[PDB]
């Protein structure tokens, strides 16, 4: 066993009844003085390194050609001047195993952390040396972390796409289904997770040109997509991951759910395609009143009204659907469907739950389209227009397929540096650059939506780490007050940066004029309610930083009205799974699953303590499963009120609790304004 492995395992060997957390630090030293420094490839100077990486097809030469070598040297020197040290063994291990650039045979390390950060910063700046240094300082301080696609692939010749998630709308036609399968394979080839809205597809037993009971429903398309994602599995490196979203009022909703039952037959079971359910407020109202609900056949509704079932408001059209004899429907028990959802989530963690009305009551771009589904991580909530892929030799009507670039603020590092504004603006600029340089030649709706919406996702990580390292319980009202203030600041500065980009470029996102940003409605709660901290401890935490007031929000509203906004969507809180290790941060705004996690790598086992875990903050690092899910819902709703897109909200459940407890948590989330629920992980 390696020396650093033994040093890391020495953490759990208690001394005087206490964990040896400091041993972890020793491990990193070993991991660098025995493996990383020996396995790294050193050159005489930076010129030889850059030339070797360029000619050997490791780096794209275009982004490096925008800078003179003196500027690149200055950027690299700025990166190395911080003398960044990984405080935990797992941070360095995760970076050098998942994100550091290696040779073709993967026998040596070509990229250090500073090298990777410098390359990403130079790609972000697009020829601006000062901007590149700003990005270097932002990432080496670990205030901002680009998503895994962006951080791993920026400036690389053998790179994939920098966009993490893609959302596709599938129209009710064989041509559209085949095009959706093709685009899903193309985007999984690019490495991104693909989500498909199957609510427009007509249910099982519908007519294909006057021959009835002909359609296979959404389950056949689900099987096709599952095989497509199995085939396109990132060249066999990462398993192809897809998501299917169906409205709960679709007739196939049961069969949909039956794809995830552990007793499902092979002709129905789907195993590589995640499932999500979109629940309008009408379904929750029907379940609450115990009135029997009706699921609908989408094609009959489309024939009668000319629009898809998910294209209009069910809260106002459900009674018209039920009373219409030309609309076909089936009777269901909404409470039984809710119990089935809870049982499925207990068994397998599926489906994702999207509260459609919670998303669309604060959605700023309802004029473009209502949000009808979410992404594979159930945090992207954007307007999408379905595409009409016609026959060959016929022009296709290209719609809008959602796609946003992810980037997370490290809350602990951002607040320690007292740089919410600067970090938010620089992250917005980096995400705007990632969107601008993204061009996908096989997904036309994705390309058009990227060019028009200009949507980005600016997330946050290390919420629980910051709260526990500052002596604040994650479930406490003080923690929710901190989240309210911090994310109001993040939203304020993201809107300010979006408006500044719109002013400097003279262009807004497409159809911005009909948005609530243009009409000023979006700023209502910000121009009437003060989001400054209500607790003295939180206010002290925010000292040295100008917390925006109602007057600052009014000025920002006027600025947006004058100049517009460059981005249709700005903030989305992704799960941030593996890149949180490198940043020494807790995953996303979720509470920690465990204080010390035991992970098996190779034939060895390693223990990763939570960042900053110690004796004095052991009980502030409360495990998520031990927490009240209602207070976690309260925290997520408090954050969500300042996030325009959704938050990947994983439910952390105990084995003792029943499906009724899961249903109660889901209904409280819906009541509190939670937009989406990601996972039901049971301990």
């Amino acid at each position: 066993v390696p020396k650093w492995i033994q040093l890391n395992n020495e953490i759990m060997i208690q001394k005087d009844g206490k964990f040896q957390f400091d041993k972890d630090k020793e491990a990193v030293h070993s991991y660098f003085v025995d493996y990383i420094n020996q396995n790294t490839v050193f050159f005489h100077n930076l010129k030889e390194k850059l030339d070797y990486l360029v000619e050997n097809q490791y780096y794209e030469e275009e982004f490096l050609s925008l800078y003179s070598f003196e500027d690149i040297k200055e950027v690299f020197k700025t990166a190395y001047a911080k003398k960044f040290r990984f405080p935990s063994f797992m941070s360095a291990f995760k970076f050098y195993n998942d994100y550091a650039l290696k040779t073709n045979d993967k026998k040596k390390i070509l990229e250090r952390y500073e090298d990777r950060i410098s390359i990403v910063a130079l790609f972000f700046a697009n020829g601006d040396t000062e901007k590149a240094k700003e990005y270097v300082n932002l990432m080496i301080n670990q205030e901002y972390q680009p998503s895994t696609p962006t951080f791993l692939n920026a400036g690389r010749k053998r790179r994939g796409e920098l966009v993490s998630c893609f959302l596709l709308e599938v129209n009710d036609s064989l041509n559209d289904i085949s095009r959706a399968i093709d685009i899903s394979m193309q985007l999984s080839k690019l490495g991104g997770g693909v989500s498909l809205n199957l609510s427009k597809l007509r249910a099982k037993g519908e007519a294909i040109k006057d021959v009835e009971n002909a359609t296979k429903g959404v389950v056949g398309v689900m099987k096709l997509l599952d095989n497509a994602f199995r085939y396109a599995d990132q060249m066999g490196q990462r398993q192809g991951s897809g998501a299917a979203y169906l409205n709960i009022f679709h007739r196939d909703i049961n069969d949909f759910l039956d794809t995830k039952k552990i007793s499902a037959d092979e002709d129905v079971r789907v195993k590589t395609l995640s499932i999500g359910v979109v629940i309008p407020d009408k379904f929750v109202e029907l379940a609450r009143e115990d009135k029997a609900a009706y699921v609908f056949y989408p094609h009959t509704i489309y024939k009668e009204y000319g629009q898809h079932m998910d294209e209009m408001d069910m809260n106002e059209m459900y009674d018209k659907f039920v009373d219409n004899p030309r609309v076909k429907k089936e009777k269901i028990n909404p409470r039984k469907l809710l119990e089935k959802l809870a049982m499925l989530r207990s068994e397998s963690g599926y489906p994702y739950i999207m509260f459609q009305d919670n998303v669309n009551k604060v959605h700023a771009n309802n004029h473009i389209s209502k949000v009808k589904f979410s992404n594979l991580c159930s945090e992207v909530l954007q307007a999408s227009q379905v595409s009409s892929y016609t026959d060959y030799d016929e022009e296709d009507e290209i719609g809008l397929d959602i796609s946003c670039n992810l980037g997370s603020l490290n809350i602990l590092n951002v607040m320690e540096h007292k740089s919410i504004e600067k970090t938010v603006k620089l992250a917005t600029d980096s995400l705007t650059h990632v969107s601008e340089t993204t061009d996908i030649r096989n997904a036309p709706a994705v390309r058009r939506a990227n060019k028009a919406m200009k949507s980005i996702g600016l997330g946050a990580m290390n919420l629980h780490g910051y709260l526990a390292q500052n002596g604040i319980a994650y479930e406490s009202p003080e923690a929710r007050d901190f989240a309210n203030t911090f994310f109001m600041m993040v939203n304020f500065y993201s809107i300010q940066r979006s408006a500044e980009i719109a002013k400097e470029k003279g262009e807004t996102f497409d159809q911005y004029e009909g948005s609530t940003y243009a009409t000023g409605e979006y700023f209502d709660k910000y121009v009437s309610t003060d989001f400054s901290p209500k607790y003295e401890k939180i206010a002290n935490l925010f000292e040295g930083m100008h917390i925006p007031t109602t007057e600052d929000w009014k000025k920002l509203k006027a600025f947006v009205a004058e100049h517009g906004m460059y981005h249709s969507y700005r903030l989305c809180i992704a799960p941030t799974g593996s890149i949180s290790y490198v940043q020494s941060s807790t995953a996303s705004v979720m509470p920690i699953m465990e204080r010390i996690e035991e992970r098996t790598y190779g034939n060895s086992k390693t223990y990763y303590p939570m960042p900053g875990l110690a004796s004095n903050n052991w009980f502030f690092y409360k495990e998520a499963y031990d927490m009240d899910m209602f207070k976690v819902v309260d925290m997520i709703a408090t954050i969500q009120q300042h996030i325009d897109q959704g938050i990947s909200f994983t439910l952390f459940l105990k084995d003792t609790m029943t499906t009724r407890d899961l249903n109660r948590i889901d209904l409280y989330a819906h009541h509190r304004g939670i937009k989406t629920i990601y996972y039901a992980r049971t301990k």
Binding site: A287, R288, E339, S346, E347, N603, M657, T658, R660, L662
Partner: protein, 289 residues
């Protein structure tokens, strides 16, 4: 948590000797040397003799002392496979490859063999020591059973798998592979029943049961090494067979919920080629907060 699942896997693996035609093995059997034929015969007789103990005593005695209708049914099914399927299959292989007089002599030899007898009687001794309503003695017998199913058979299985991986004696090798696949699931199942007993014990009693299991494993392992040299030195395979024994000993321990005893080793590639949460209804007022 597991008996119905094992029921399903067991019954869907049902097979009969008649399904595999054996006569075509004579086309490769005739080309083996005397030492190869001798080792094969001796190994086969070893497996036959041990499996008979499992059919007549091992499985039925465990079925007798285990509580639970569904467990008794699965255990009955496993006992049936030993007596009705496996025993007939071994007999069929023998009758195909050797004349009656040769079969009788091989069984006379293996019946007198010191290393085969040592392990056979050690296992049988633990089955005979089970006492009514004593879960400790039952556990010890289950450990013995898992060691037979998941470990002791494998010094024997090695040779048919070795031929099977080379394209020799393919019909009997197919039969052996089906038998081995049954013994694997038998070992896993009995292992889960043993862990159930183990988990009901105090910490001191657990440590004592662990010591029992490791001590028993050691005794059997040291005899397996001698058994192995006795049979396989004449065909030059003992080194590789020993690696296969240790690898299968580790599987047997894992079946009993214990850590592996031996370091990980690679296996001969020819042999490798041969080888619900509680549903509670919504009560209303759960929609109001």
């Amino acid at each position: 948590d597991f008996t119905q699942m094992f029921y399903n896997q067991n019954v869907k693996q049902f097979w009969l000797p008649e399904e595999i035609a054996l006569n075509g093995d004579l086309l490769t059997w005739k080309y083996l040397g005397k030492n190869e034929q001798d080792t094969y015969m001796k190994v086969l007789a070893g497996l036959t003799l041990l499996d008979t103990e499992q059919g007549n005593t091992g499985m039925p005695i465990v079925a007798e002392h285990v509580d639970g209708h569904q467990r008794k049914a699965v255990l009955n099914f496993m006992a049936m496979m030993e007596n009705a399927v496996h025993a007939k299959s071994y007999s069929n292989i023998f009758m195909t490859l050797a004349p009656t007089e040769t079969i009788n002599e091989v069984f006379e030899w293996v019946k007198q063999n010191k290393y085969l007898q040592k392990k056979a009687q050690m296992i049988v001794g633990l089955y005979k020591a089970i006492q009514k309503d004593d879960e400790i003695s039952l556990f010890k017998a289950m450990v013995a059973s898992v060691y037979l199913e998941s470990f002791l058979f494998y010094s024997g299985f090695y040779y048919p798998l070795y031929f099977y991986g080379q394209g020799k004696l393919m019909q009997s090798g197919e039969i052996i592979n089906l038998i081995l696949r049954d013994e694997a699931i038998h070992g896993v199942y009995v292992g889960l029943l043993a862990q159930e007993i183990y988990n009901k014990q105090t910490e001191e009693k657990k440590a004592e049961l662990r010591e029992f299991a490791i001590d028993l494993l050691n005794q059997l392992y040291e005899n397996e090494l001698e058994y192995t040299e006795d049979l396989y030195d004449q065909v030059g395979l003992s080194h590789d067979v020993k690696k296969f024994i240790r690898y299968n000993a580790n599987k047997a321990l894992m079946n009993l919920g214990f850590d592996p005893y031996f370091e990980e080793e690679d296996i001969n590639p020819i042999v490798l080629n041969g080888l619900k949460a509680t549903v509670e209804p919504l009560k209303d007022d759960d929609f109001y907060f």
